[PDB]
Amino acid sequence: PTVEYLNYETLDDQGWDMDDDDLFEKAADAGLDGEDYGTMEVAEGEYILEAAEAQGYDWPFSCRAGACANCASIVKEGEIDMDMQQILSDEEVEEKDVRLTCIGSPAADEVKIVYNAKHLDYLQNRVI
Ligand code: FES
Numbered sequence: 001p002t003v004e005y006l007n008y009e010t011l012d013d014q015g016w017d018m019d020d021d022d023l024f025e026k027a028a029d030a031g032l033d034g035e036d037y038g039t040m041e042v043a044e045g046e047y048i049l050e051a052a053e054a055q056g057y058d059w060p061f062s063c064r065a066g067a068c069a070n071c072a073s074i075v076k077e078g079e080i081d082m083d084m085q086q087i088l089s090d091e092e093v094e095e096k097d098v099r100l101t102c103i104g105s106p107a108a109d110e111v112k113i114v115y116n117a118k119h120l121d122y123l124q125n126r127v128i
Contacts, residue, residue: 001106002109002111003106003111003113004037004039004040004112005114006023006027006113006115007036007114009036009119010023011023011114018076019076024037035056035057036115040055042105042106044107049101052115059071060117060118061102064102065103066083066085067087068087069092069117071102072092072100072120073099073101073114074114075097076114078106079106079107079111080105080113082099082104083104096120101115
């Protein structure tokens with residue numbers, strides 16, 4: 001039950017690559033904020049945003065029922081289990097690797113994922 005969360009905003013701000021500089025690995029040498037990069041440990045049956053929230057990590061959330069994408073993320077690798085529902089578009093689960101962190105649990109041992117997907121330029125336009 002090991003995972004590595006990464007700040008999607010840090011990837012853009014720094015202007016790094018998605019998997020070229022191996023942020024999940026080079027990040028440990030940057031000592032960035034723990035709320036941006038770190039190894040998230042979650043057992044089977046435990047919600048990510050929940051296991052990380054008990055450590056000090058922060059995640060975007062609004063519906064908290066797996067019916068919206070505010071808590072959207074970007075799994076860079078591994079696999080996560082979802083509930084009986086699918087509000088996101090497979091394109092986001094395959095082209096953006098987005099998942100539900102409020103109601104999503106890791107089904108693999110090691111998994112990579114970026115937290116705070118709301119930073120995506122596709123949503124930033126929602127700003128009023
Ligand atoms: S907070 Fe709505 S799907 Fe996660």
